[PDB]
């Protein structure tokens, strides 16, 4: 390959506001078909069986580049992809002089690398605060997985086989990838991202067009159903629960997806525990299902957010459950404001509440109802004792 | 034969990995390099490097330039003077920078790592840390004490773990000296080295009545200058303690009891 | 059945009318406020035209 | 999933054979891969009607192939019966 | 006028992409 002289300059992009905290901060290198650095070799000269080994080596090198997220000699970017904007569709093009065998294998590996880069930009964008800290934790989990599994096994197996393993084949490479099963996990993550994206599309197109128990109850409560351009908190949890429900047969997939879901919603369990044990409302990302005003002078209004809820709240049982939780939180906050204490200690009563660990287990089991009833009885007992003795 | 012998005639005009490492160590430690003219913004990468390796070294040089800008900002804030909380914050930034330098020196001295991909996957944590630190220093020279505390609390509530740990460290380093100043004011009634980071001060300016402070008590107390974890009643009690101490020390001459 | 049914219905009608006359405690609102984290919140919007100048230089480079 | 596992196992087997190249005669190659050939034949014979039978018919045919005198068919039948039960 | 200037810049982006 003849080395062609072009101008390669990389400078610091002094713009970092639109790009999130975990995004790109440097310009991209020139492409092959824009500022060529190496003369592209004719693939028809190596398509012969005598040079088919050299052709396979070159195409697996280009495929490793595509996997790690970079361009190759015979496999370059597409017209719709621009390295300047993050919101552009990432596609690749392969020289047709390559044999259809390596062409199909490169198409598969290009789909893999495109899903990788798309998920990369996805968690980069989700790192922003406009998506909520739940989506930020999902982004961090996606990035940690891609850093500790995907590229890890890439560098461990495929690069080593391309470097110091003779008689290696791209078919053996694909079989090793299927054995490591990272390709299926990446495909499922891309499908989940596509579901999130179509949900965002629906919640962005529904622009123009989007009970008597609240009146019966003597509580200043209301409904705040403000929809966001992106699902946040409870919406993401419901989407992931639907994904787990539709996932049937792949128990290991369900297992690691449940692990990721627990790692993500860990903060939501602590927020719910704090709200149900102390009535403290700390929702800086608009993810909790309840928030009060005054963040009439003494009586504030508690608004329930249905866009970030954990259930449907349509049946009478669910409505009464949510009303009970809200009344518990209201009584806790009232006791706190009356006693001038920042936190109600557990020794003030004979009822102790344990922190939620597994969100899916809490949802599928009646332990949620048990803890809610326990905390509600504790709050009612404390309120009655206070208003009866003081 | 091996695929390296087949790929050689396509990369006979490349730079070896040893030279690449020896020069990237220079570009990370800011020493002048010949293959890469590492100036303030431009790197002038040659054309003999493949595009994937070009992008990899571009990312590494971006990290190095972020470290350089961070060091320059620490030097600027060091030759300047600000409140001791932000001074200690800049000290912690310098400790993080020197830890990154110690890490890269350990890496280049060991040389056990053979793949730049694994090098990047290992130094990605420090790269993200340096990115967070330069994003902070981008507006560090513009925020005040209350805004810094609010942003630290926000980053503590943030879902990420590294940002949360950094925010907790900075918030602890701030609240330590904040409570130290509170102690000093509550004990000796001193407001030295405050730099506007307190909620009680003195207003000597007089409109004509009681110029010599016979009954004026020129001590003022602000409301919104206190954080959220301190009650307004406690702040008013602290202000009254200081006021009564100054009163006993100045007007009643109860020197022994005040001491 | 009809006796107790109409009795409960009259009681419910009276209660609902009185509750609606007493300020209507039932309400619905829409969230019109968002948080601002100054360390990450954009300070100015002129950075958009700064990026515009960046991509103008990029267009000049592509033309060259 | 088990069918695809058998397919990828046959793929890895032939890939290892090609990478080794120790086989010198195509007759020996065929007499060695005859087991995988018969396995793939049984698998495609199953998939010829897999898209037409229900779970009860699947279990009945698995029990029939377990009672069958052959060994590989019986083993595959027990494997599928266990994965179903 | 800021949105108008940005949309003119979008026109320029489309033109340069056509040239690309």
XYZ file of C-alpha atoms in Angstrom, chain B residues 15-213:
199
model
C 6.118 3.556 13.312
C 6.947 0.644 15.659
C 4.977 0.104 18.845
C 8.017 0.816 21.032
C 8.555 4.223 19.424
C 4.805 4.896 19.577
C 4.828 4.223 23.325
C 8.001 6.240 23.938
C 6.513 9.225 22.099
C 3.040 9.003 23.633
C 4.707 9.003 27.055
C 6.354 12.290 26.059
C 3.084 13.756 24.773
C 1.360 12.752 28.020
C 4.154 14.144 30.225
C 4.201 17.388 28.157
C 7.825 16.980 27.040
C 8.458 18.071 23.460
C 8.195 15.300 20.868
C 9.533 15.296 17.316
C 6.973 13.034 15.622
C 4.155 14.981 17.325
C 4.672 18.748 17.740
C 2.622 18.890 20.938
C 1.693 22.573 21.164
C -1.250 24.065 23.064
C -3.925 22.946 20.590
C -2.331 21.327 17.528
C -0.633 17.926 17.510
C 0.236 17.641 13.793
C -0.212 13.878 13.469
C 1.670 12.407 10.473
C -0.027 10.515 7.658
C 1.916 7.238 7.967
C -0.298 6.092 10.871
C -3.315 3.884 10.038
C -6.731 5.426 10.581
C -7.681 3.217 13.539
C -4.340 3.803 15.258
C -4.755 7.466 14.290
C -8.061 7.664 16.152
C -6.625 5.803 19.139
C -3.689 8.200 19.446
C -6.145 11.061 18.877
C -8.106 9.958 21.945
C -4.907 9.548 23.968
C -3.709 13.011 22.912
C -7.127 14.412 23.837
C -6.679 12.946 27.318
C -3.162 14.386 27.488
C -4.371 17.829 26.419
C -7.113 17.666 29.048
C -4.447 16.876 31.648
C -2.336 19.787 30.372
C -5.247 22.231 30.585
C -6.070 20.941 34.069
C -2.484 21.480 35.205
C -2.475 24.984 33.742
C -5.722 25.779 35.566
C -4.300 24.446 38.841
C -1.205 26.614 38.363
C -3.413 29.644 37.665
C -5.574 29.059 40.746
C -2.392 28.485 42.764
C -0.761 31.776 41.788
C -4.144 33.422 42.376
C -5.973 33.595 45.714
C -9.493 32.425 46.579
C -11.403 31.203 49.630
C -9.694 28.303 51.455
C -12.456 25.816 50.558
C -11.887 26.274 46.828
C -8.143 26.444 47.521
C -8.272 22.962 49.063
C -10.459 21.886 46.136
C -7.705 23.015 43.745
C -5.213 21.138 45.935
C -7.301 17.977 45.522
C -7.405 18.586 41.763
C -3.601 18.752 41.778
C -3.437 15.515 43.787
C -5.672 13.833 41.200
C -3.444 15.164 38.411
C -0.245 13.938 40.064
C -1.903 10.566 40.694
C -2.653 10.330 36.970
C 0.985 11.216 36.263
C 2.216 8.567 38.706
C -0.075 6.025 37.036
C 1.177 6.802 33.532
C 4.805 6.727 34.723
C 4.196 3.335 36.341
C 2.647 2.133 33.076
C 5.506 3.321 30.864
C 8.096 1.958 33.307
C 6.482 -1.481 33.585
C 5.625 -1.924 29.913
C 3.909 -5.241 30.634
C 0.880 -4.172 28.574
C 1.263 -4.986 24.885
C -2.039 -3.803 23.336
C -3.040 -0.148 23.061
C -6.681 -1.271 23.137
C -6.220 -2.703 26.630
C -4.130 0.349 27.551
C -7.110 2.551 26.671
C -9.608 0.240 28.384
C -7.483 0.488 31.547
C -6.879 4.261 31.447
C -10.507 5.047 30.546
C -11.267 5.593 34.244
C -8.540 8.224 34.591
C -9.625 9.754 31.270
C -13.201 10.121 32.535
C -11.882 11.555 35.809
C -9.791 14.153 33.971
C -12.801 14.975 31.789
C -14.958 15.567 34.873
C -12.214 17.690 36.435
C -11.777 19.929 33.389
C -15.557 20.242 33.010
C -15.572 21.440 36.622
C -12.676 23.872 36.166
C -14.420 25.310 33.089
C -16.813 27.116 35.459
C -14.882 26.867 38.747
C -13.620 30.437 38.270
C -17.214 31.734 38.036
C -19.198 30.068 40.842
C -19.516 31.168 44.465
C -19.538 29.162 47.682
C -23.280 28.532 47.821
C -23.378 27.560 44.140
C -20.420 25.212 44.634
C -22.115 23.551 47.612
C -25.370 23.193 45.659
C -23.562 21.642 42.689
C -21.686 19.276 45.009
C -24.976 18.159 46.567
C -26.435 17.690 43.075
C -23.479 15.546 42.003
C -23.837 13.564 45.232
C -27.481 12.914 44.340
C -26.303 12.045 40.813
C -26.678 8.426 39.742
C -23.022 8.064 38.765
C -20.463 6.768 41.261
C -17.244 8.620 40.365
C -18.947 12.022 40.237
C -20.694 11.172 43.509
C -17.414 10.227 45.205
C -15.673 13.386 43.974
C -18.625 15.494 45.132
C -18.600 13.862 48.574
C -14.851 14.455 48.905
C -15.116 18.122 47.917
C -18.185 18.664 50.112
C -16.397 17.163 53.120
C -13.295 19.277 52.480
C -15.547 22.347 52.315
C -17.733 21.592 55.342
C -14.684 20.861 57.511
C -13.313 24.388 57.170
C -16.856 25.799 57.193
C -17.441 24.283 60.634
C -13.966 25.523 61.583
C -15.021 29.086 60.733
C -18.292 28.579 62.614
C -16.298 27.421 65.649
C -13.946 30.405 65.399
C -16.834 32.876 65.218
C -18.730 31.180 68.053
C -15.666 31.119 70.323
C -13.588 34.247 69.639
C -16.007 36.233 67.466
C -13.499 36.472 64.614
C -14.361 36.770 60.915
C -10.851 36.788 59.441
C -10.094 35.037 56.138
C -13.846 34.879 55.502
C -13.783 35.989 51.836
C -17.552 36.436 51.969
C -18.109 32.797 52.971
C -19.985 33.588 56.204
C -23.486 34.790 57.062
C -22.516 37.219 59.862
C -20.474 40.377 59.313
C -20.022 43.955 60.534
C -21.498 47.093 58.956
C -19.521 50.140 60.108
C -21.270 52.568 57.731
C -23.450 55.016 59.663
C -26.093 57.466 58.432
C -25.340 59.971 61.233
C -27.102 58.534 64.289
C -24.860 56.758 66.826
C -21.649 57.153 64.842
C -19.449 55.880 67.694
C -21.657 52.782 68.218
